[PDB]
Design an enzyme around this catalytic site. Structure first.
Site, PDB file in Angstrom:
ATOM      1  N   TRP A 276      26.286 -66.322  -4.655  1.00  0.00           N
ATOM      2  CA  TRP A 276      27.286 -67.260  -4.156  1.00  0.00           C
ATOM      3  C   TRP A 276      28.643 -67.062  -4.867  1.00  0.00           C
ATOM      4  CZ3 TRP A 276      22.034 -67.828  -4.765  1.00  0.00           C
ATOM      5  CH2 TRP A 276      21.263 -68.468  -3.783  1.00  0.00           C
TER       6      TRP A 276
ATOM      7  N   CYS B  99      21.054 -69.115   1.582  1.00  0.00           N
ATOM      8  CA  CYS B  99      19.939 -69.851   2.193  1.00  0.00           C
ATOM      9  C   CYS B  99      19.611 -69.461   3.643  1.00  0.00           C
ATOM     10  CB  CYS B  99      20.155 -71.361   2.043  1.00  0.00           C
ATOM     11  SG  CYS B  99      21.588 -71.953   2.977  1.00  0.00           S
TER      12      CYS B  99
ATOM     13  N   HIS C 187      21.992 -77.206   4.475  1.00  0.00           N
ATOM     14  CA  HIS C 187      21.044 -76.281   3.861  1.00  0.00           C
ATOM     15  C   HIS C 187      19.979 -75.865   4.869  1.00  0.00           C
ATOM     16  CE1 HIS C 187      18.536 -74.386   0.931  1.00  0.00           C
ATOM     17  NE2 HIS C 187      17.667 -75.398   0.848  1.00  0.00           N
TER      18      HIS C 187
ATOM     19  N   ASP D 246      10.836 -73.541   1.747  1.00  0.00           N
ATOM     20  CA  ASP D 246      12.190 -73.130   1.385  1.00  0.00           C
ATOM     21  C   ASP D 246      12.136 -71.962   0.410  1.00  0.00           C
ATOM     22  OD1 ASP D 246      14.851 -72.808   0.764  1.00  0.00           O
ATOM     23  OD2 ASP D 246      15.114 -74.841  -0.046  1.00  0.00           O
TER      24      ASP D 246
ATOM     25  N   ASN E  18      15.926 -87.510   1.130  1.00  0.00           N
ATOM     26  CA  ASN E  18      15.842 -88.948   0.837  1.00  0.00           C
ATOM     27  C   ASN E  18      16.645 -89.440  -0.381  1.00  0.00           C
ATOM     28  OD1 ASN E  18      14.185 -89.908   3.058  1.00  0.00           O
ATOM     29  ND2 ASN E  18      12.504 -88.800   2.219  1.00  0.00           N
TER      30      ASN E  18
ATOM     31  N   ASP F 217      19.669 -90.943  -2.782  1.00  0.00           N
ATOM     32  CA  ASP F 217      20.865 -91.788  -2.679  1.00  0.00           C
ATOM     33  C   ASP F 217      22.075 -91.132  -3.350  1.00  0.00           C
ATOM     34  OD1 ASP F 217      19.004 -93.683  -1.667  1.00  0.00           O
ATOM     35  OD2 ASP F 217      18.884 -94.778  -3.555  1.00  0.00           O
TER      36      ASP F 217
ATOM     37  N   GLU G 193      16.435 -95.277   9.520  1.00  0.00           N
ATOM     38  CA  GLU G 193      17.007 -95.858   8.306  1.00  0.00           C
ATOM     39  C   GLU G 193      17.233 -97.374   8.415  1.00  0.00           C
ATOM     40  OE1 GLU G 193      20.708 -93.722   7.521  1.00  0.00           O
ATOM     41  OE2 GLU G 193      21.485 -94.204   9.505  1.00  0.00           O
TER      42      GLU G 193
ATOM     43  N   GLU H 266      10.952 -96.831   6.272  1.00  0.00           N
ATOM     44  CA  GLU H 266      11.676 -96.049   5.270  1.00  0.00           C
ATOM     45  C   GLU H 266      11.298 -96.498   3.854  1.00  0.00           C
ATOM     46  OE1 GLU H 266      16.001 -96.602   5.149  1.00  0.00           O
ATOM     47  OE2 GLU H 266      16.271 -94.549   4.455  1.00  0.00           O
TER      48      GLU H 266
ATOM     49  N   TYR I 109      30.267 -74.342   0.539  1.00  0.00           N
ATOM     50  CA  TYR I 109      29.458 -75.233   1.390  1.00  0.00           C
ATOM     51  C   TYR I 109      28.325 -75.923   0.621  1.00  0.00           C
ATOM     52  CZ  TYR I 109      25.836 -71.711   1.318  1.00  0.00           C
ATOM     53  OH  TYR I 109      24.908 -70.820   0.899  1.00  0.00           O
TER      54      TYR I 109
END
Lengths: 722, 307, 307, 523
Positions: free
Chosen positions: D175, D210, D269, D292, D332, D334, D381, D386, D456
């Site tokens: 990167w 990615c 991503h 991933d 998920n 915050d 949400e 949730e 990004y």
């Protein structure tokens, strides 16, 4: 530029940065009288080995002059200022800092607030006394704190920013795992188990075969000078993120993967080649101490290791960081199982063993570690002992170590949980299958033995050197319904049985067969006796075969040293006994290390087509090394140690190395003898100056170009110095 | 020794569901961890907690309580981003302009309890004059129905009836959220329910009125006595009051043969209780006309056969 | 729609226990995968199956049957090596010389049927003169207790008992392995209780004896419509099975007022049903003759004063 | 198959002649005979090893076995079978097999969630030498042949080969925006030339990121016959270490503290989903598994994550293998806004649960349009489900280091939001900030705009514009600030993918409350 990450990964404890001795805030004026604010003149850690800080933390054993504490528990410091501290006017804090890129939310920069009372489970410092210019703090670390060597600073707040102490390497503090603290994930509620599984530095490793359990000592030496720094260096060489080193699961998962070296990464090069060119034979090592110091000083993989050597080195690593840990030996281990609960033996049509196809093997014994921790990644009730086999096996992720697998999950067959549980379950719960490979190319299952694999599992007893049987901690009583429930639960979650044992049944003949091999000293003839017994009113004729093989302890054969055939007629309700003599000259030219022999007896009953088949092992007894001591056994006094060895063979031993060890009594030492004539004896003498009191042990080993895996030990009481 | 626990909304360690017959019944001073599912919590507000085996069974008791939900609050606001609340934690709410809470203030705090919130979150519109409500089994002191800020209304109940404070005659004050206490007449209010042992109930509240159905339950190794459903009439609780017991031997409802009738359906049929069966028109009775409950089993009934 | 499946000795996909209020009830023709614990199997002999929601509820029902264990037989052998046998799987046993199987053979194959073995495995002894077995709640038609091969004996059961072939009188023949059928006196068994949605019943059997009693239960926020207890008799189950439905939809029985009778006695009463109370001769009513079951409540019953 | 074949390991396979082929067994049926010749219908096991097999025919005699010599014209590839009901990769719909196995041109989604961009990608799984290259990737992994019959292990080992640490892997990750001595990750048109360059040079290819790793791994899975797709997550919380909290630090005056703010949220991503049953797990966790191939710190170390069951992730059921807590935390987490006070204390000012994983997308079946799949990864949400998923994840070792338990809504009843208009690279564009006061109070507000040029991955390089506003909101009112951003401010400075990130932060003077918002955009 560098777009992958905003700051480089904080993954080396050896790496540092220069925190500013002043950080300015706002437009600071010309010539501020900073001497109105506090300045630190000295910091005391009360770090002496006889003092409350190391004594109450159980860190006084380590041969290290810096402060060592265990997380989640309080310790004292004193700070001396330029003037008395005045809570009305003085804000200051202690900072603990680790790695080159420390960040507060990553747990690697730790500001410790001054508080009225220490809150449960929080970093904090309480002023317990003030007198003149000095403040005494009781500091508490978080029970989830990162484990490693923290830098320490003291920082004073001002209207003009922060004033901070310069780099002072005297203050660097090791924070370790804490088995004594109820909030630590590694908490162990029993005193004698903490004494054994954390504070004992001498282990016992169990070897041989289950009918003749041999034993040897092993120096874990986790308190020896430079071993703790080497355990931090192992995690830095793994490039393990410092923020992850607070987790005993990840330290066990990563640290075990560092022990076996694939390439030039890792602590020990594995070898089973019986030759050991350009390195040390795996059966020569007396302890973990010289392996870890050779790794730390050479920076390269040590040559060579095998399963109990990996287990010894990993046990030192775990106990050194403070995760409670032990070695366990499993007898008849189904290693390299690939989660298959079946090991295959192939037979010719006439009932002789087909050696061409029989390439599965059952290890006479195998060693792995157990580490004690809670498992917050799993559902309730899978905490306690976690099995970690640092030996590489073909696995869910190629060829690698297995675990931490919860022992409590393994016993009940709940192999759906991480890590690698099907492969560990199969070590202890596999079955033998005997298969006729017919001349037409078809395979017929003739016989099954569910009883052979994992016949016993053992570890050193708490506070003594006897074996403790732990088989019942890994599996239920054999043949009972709870063993079937555990097996069926394992089959729900990816344990395997390739061949359906439905076309197999009790013998038509009702003939029993069994045989006994007497134990022997190396270089002696011995008796093997086979019995056949008829429980029927019929008359039977039997052709039976004995195959005797020299094998490595992994059960891999090298040569069939004896082969015999017997024809037996059993009358109604009768029995018959065949006695076989095995002579020293049949095996003595051909033995591998550990001197292990393996016998197959098989037979086909002519009138019923039934196959009888049994297999047993022996390990030849080799005389111990004799250790003796002279002069006073007092700490700091000179003591004279004599190591004696007598050649047991009918040959000249060559390039003989004798090794000597004993944590707190002597560093690892070794001696070279060019030759030892057939019936001859050698002596070696050293002067050693013991530095640890109480009960201690001297440990010795021998190796050469032919004979190796020979040991001896002596318990020495060492008196306290005047 | 202690049996296999029945953890509603929760679990013990997963192997105990398979190995039940090996591990249970379990010896005294064994400790057993349990946990509640998401959306539920233990008596202490934990997700995971330990019970210990005792001569009386498990203690503390393996129960999991549902988290109380954020209210669909009428004419009001709340302080919090939270959807769900712990058992015996509390939550603050308040009013739109011109409105007053269920408790008559601008703001109110509510506790999450076993059956829901300690008071229902709601804001009433806020105004000046109170109206005197309809007074079943009583009469007001005046013809006036409308009362201003800090005016008072006095009222008297019918023969043997009592006011909202339990007097024969009462007086109360108008305020901008409504009356300080509401004018009402009733018989003497249904008793504050006698707390049982080894069991519990739903509709838990401090006082009850005509209707107000309550349902009782026993815990493991105990069986209820009385009906599960009880409700007070204005004259008192019916049936009288339930009790828990780990040895209940009471029958189901009486078996009825085809072409037959029985003299009265009782609310209960304990060990030693009897029912008498009568065959209907053109039929005669075969076997004993009386049947008995014993050990929670009815004696097998008679048959009705044509004349 | 189909409610939450109470899987017996087994589980559904384990998020459905947490997310119950999201997923249930399911639509018709939706399919759901369920599985047995170790030691149990579905009726096909599979460890796991798909059930489907239908107008009949979950079909086939999510029931896991227990594996048959290896029998404790003597004077013989079992060919099969295994300890536990799947439902619908079969097993072979054989006699020593001078003994014959439960089926009278040299060797016998038995199946683990839908619950339990097809015959009890045992190797008995050649009965030169068979011995008549014990016959509780019955009598042999003769004082003789020993009989020759190809002799016969006839027996009759007591009132309310049935012979081993389901008659009330039955005959058997002596053979070289014992009797052609074994004499016994027995009772008719009530049919299997199917799995309900949203709840369970605790005493579980394939069929139930006369005088067996079953207690039902529901998971939270569901309630058991109908009886708490049900009993088996030789005529069958007396009540219909209760159901875990929503709300309550059921009232406890009213009192009968002094000097009064009712138009319909019932085992249970439900929302919208009326109990109508009538005074006895030479008595006169006060209050409503009608009372109705409403939200689990009743309206207050009447009084019957002297005329 | 291989050099050391064994029958009990499944790497030597004698095929028995039979009157009928059984379900789930190797066998051959003689369907026809014609003079010198026999025609066999052969069947392979649904659990067979995947790879290239040598074939022989062997005839038995009283004296031994007579066998055909080595004939390379008869070597047979055996692949995974999405069309067979007994195969662990069985897919029960033909349009989904046609897309997720037989389609050789993919679409990759990039940009930002208000302005989604698309590009094609040649998977080319059928092209000359790509099948042999997928076998070569497993041979370079040194994967045991008896393990190549398992789609979980082929996904678990194949994904670990995609990113190279030292030698021994397909692509070198970079990167650095310079890409010296290699090919820029943003140049590649497809997997085909990467895989053939790896196969021919026998060393890691320079360079990947990615979507390149995901493109190559999607070719690998589709080539062996495992059904697979790429998914793009917008605002991905990568490198989370299973913490559900990303921290932004603020100065006391409400400005962003750029010295402490080192957590970064990736504008998008990419990861793969692979389709298989999970016999290692309890029932209910088959179908799409997230893999991933981009390394992060997980429980093993700096490695690829998964296969994690997507059906486990939706329910927070992260106790199951592999790496599920780290995949759950990406969708998920915050945002937490923290004032770093001058006295060295940290105070949580504001929280935003809505930003991370705002949308998850994949190419639709039979066309190039996006399909929203967000509801396959997490519940709607602000609803109870949730919270049930979050609590289940916190039971099984997901983490929240900071207790937001003391946080409450702003009692000021002020609210703030801002918009950036979409623009062409090298044009000026407008940013508009809006404030609304829902109270009878008057307020005064100081607000700051920080505009940053970023990769990004959200990693910033420079603050290209910064401005301050002092604002009055008169009671129950509303106010708007506007900014014109010019081309001469950003054009000399842009990184690849032309991404900009704006923070707007404000402190209400009277109530001391902080309002904070942030938005990316891509030119």
């Amino acid at each position: 530029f560098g777009g992958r990450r905003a700051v480089p990964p904080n993954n080396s404890n050896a790496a540092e940065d220069d925190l500013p001795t002043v950080e300015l805030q706002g437009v600071v004026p010309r010539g501020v009288n900073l001497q109105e604010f506090l300045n630190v003149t000295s910091v005391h850690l009360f770090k002496e080995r006889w003092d409350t800080n190391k004594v109450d933390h159980h860190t006084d054993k380590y041969e290290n002059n810096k402060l060592i504490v265990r997380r989640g528990q309080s310790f004292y410091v004193q700070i001396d200022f330029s003037r008395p501290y005045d809570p009305r006017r003085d804000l200051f804090r202690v900072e603990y800092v680790i790695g080159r890129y420390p960040q507060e939310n990553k747990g690697t920069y730790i500001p410790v607030p001054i508080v009225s009372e220490l809150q449960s489970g929080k970093w904090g410092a309480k002023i317990v006394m003030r007198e003149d210019r000095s403040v005494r703090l009781s500091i508490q670390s978080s029970p989830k704190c990162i484990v490693g060597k923290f830098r320490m600073y003291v920082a004073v707040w001002t209207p003009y920013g922060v004033l901070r102490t310069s780099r002072n390497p005297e203050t660097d503090t090791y924070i370790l795992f804490n088995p004594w603290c109820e909030d630590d994930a590694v908490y162990l509620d029993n005193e004698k188990e903490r004494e054994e599984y954390v504070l004992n530095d001498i282990g016992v490793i169990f070897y041989g075969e289950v009918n003749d359990i041999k034993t040897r000592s092993w120096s874990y030496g986790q308190f020896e000078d430079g071993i703790l720094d080497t355990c931090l260096y192992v995690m830095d060489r793994a490039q393990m993120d410092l923020s992850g080193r607070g987790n005993p699961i990840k330290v066990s998962r990563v640290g075990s993967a560092m022990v076996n070296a694939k390439d030039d990464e890792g602590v020990l090069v594995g070898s089973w080649d019986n030759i050991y060119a350009y390195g040390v034979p795996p059966s020569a090592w007396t302890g973990s101490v010289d392996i870890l110091l050779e790794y730390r000083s050479s920076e390269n993989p040590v040559r060579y290791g095998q399963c109990w050597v990996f287990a010894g080195v990993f046990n030192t690593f775990l106990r050194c960081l403070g995760i409670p840990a032990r070695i366990v030996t499993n007898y008849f281990s189904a290693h390299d199982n690939d989660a298959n609960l079946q090991m295959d033996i192939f037979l010719e049509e006439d009932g002789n063993v087909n050696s061409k196809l029989t390439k599965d093997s059952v290890w006479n014994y195998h060693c792995w570690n157990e580490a004690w921790m809670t498992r917050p990644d799993l559902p309730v009730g899978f905490g306690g002992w976690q099995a970690v086999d640092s030996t590489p096996q073909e696995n869910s992720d190629g060829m690698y170590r297995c675990g931490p697998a919860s022992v409590q999950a393994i016993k009940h067959g709940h192999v759906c949980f991480q890590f690698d549980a099907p492969f560990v379950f199969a070590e202890v719960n596999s079955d033998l299958i005997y298969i006729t490979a017919k001349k037409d190319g078809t395979h017929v299952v003739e016989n099954v033995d569910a009883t052979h694999i994992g016949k016993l599992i053992v570890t050193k007893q708490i506070g003594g050197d006897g074996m403790m049987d732990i088989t019942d901690t890994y599996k239920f009583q054999e043949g009972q319904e709870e063993e079937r429930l555990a097996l069926e639960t394992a089959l729900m979650y990816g344990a395997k049985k390739p061949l359906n044992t439905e076309g197999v049944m009790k013998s038509r003949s009702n003939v029993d067969m069994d045989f006994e091999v007497e134990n022997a000293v190396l270089g002696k003839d011995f008796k093997l006796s086979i019995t056949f017994r008829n429980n029927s009113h019929n008359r039977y004729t039997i052709t039976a075969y004995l195959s005797a093989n020299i094998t490595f302890y992994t059960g891999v054969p090298k040569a069939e040293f004896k082969k015999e055939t017997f024809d037996v007629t059993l009358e109604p309700l009768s029995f018959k006994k065949e006695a076989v003599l095995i002579q020293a000259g049949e095996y003595m030219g051909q033995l591998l290390e550990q001197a292990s022999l393996h016998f197959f007896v098989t037979a086909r009953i002519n009138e019923t087509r039934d196959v009888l088949a049994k297999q047993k092992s022996t390990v030849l007894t080799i005389p111990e090394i004799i250790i003796k001591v002279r002069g006073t056994q007092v700490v700091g006094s000179d003591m004279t140690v004599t190591v004696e060895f007598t050649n047991p063979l009918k040959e000249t031993l060559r390039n003989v190395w004798v090794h000597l060890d004993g944590p707190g009594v002597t560093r690892p030492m070794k001696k070279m003898f060019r030759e030892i004539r057939p019936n001859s004896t050698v002596q070696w003498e050293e002067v050693c100056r013991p530095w640890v009191s109480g009960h201690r042990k001297l440990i010795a080993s021998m190796s050469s170009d032919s004979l190796r895996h020979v040991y001896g030990e002596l318990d020495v009481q060492i008196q306290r110095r005047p | 020794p202690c049996g296999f626990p029945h953890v509603e909304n929760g679990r013990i360690a997963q192997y105990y569901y398979t190995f039940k017959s090996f591990y249970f019944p379990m010896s005294i001073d064994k400790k057993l961890s349990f946990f509640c599912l998401a959306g539920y919590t233990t008596e202490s507000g934990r997700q995971e907690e330990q019970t210990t085996c005792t001569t009386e069974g498990w203690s503390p008791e393996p129960r999991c309580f549902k988290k109380c939900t954020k209210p669909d609050l009428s004419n009001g606001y709340i302080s919090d981003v939270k959807l769900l609340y712990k058992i015996q934690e509390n939550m603050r709410y308040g009013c739109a302009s011109g409105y007053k809470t269920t408790g008559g203030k601008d703001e109110e705090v509510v506790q999450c309890l076993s059956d829901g919130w300690s008071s229902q979150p709601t804001c009433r519109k806020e105004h000046e004059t109170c109206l005197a409500p309809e007074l079943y089994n009583g009469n007001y002191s005046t013809t006036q129905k409308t009362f201003k800020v800090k005016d008072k209304v006095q009222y008297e109940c019918a023969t043997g009836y009592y006011t909202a404070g339990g007097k024969k005659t009462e007086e109360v004050e108008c305020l901008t959220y409504g009356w300080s206490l509401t004018p009402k007449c009733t018989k003497l209010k249904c008793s504050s329910l006698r707390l049982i042992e080894n069991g519990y109930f739903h509709p838990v509240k401090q006082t009850y009125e005509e209707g107000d159905v309550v349902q009782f339950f026993c815990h493991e190794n105990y069986y209820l006595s009385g009906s599960d459903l009880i409700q007070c009439y204005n004259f008192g609780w019916y049936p009288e009051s339930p009790v828990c017991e780990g040895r209940r031997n009471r029958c189901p409802p009486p078996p009825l043969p085809i072409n037959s009738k029985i003299q009265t359906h009782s609310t209960t049929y304990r060990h030693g209780e009897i029912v008498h069966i009568e065959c209907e028109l053109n039929f005669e009775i075969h076997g004993s006309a009386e049947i008995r409950c014993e050990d929670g089993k009815w004696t097998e009934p008679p048959k009705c056969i044509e004349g």
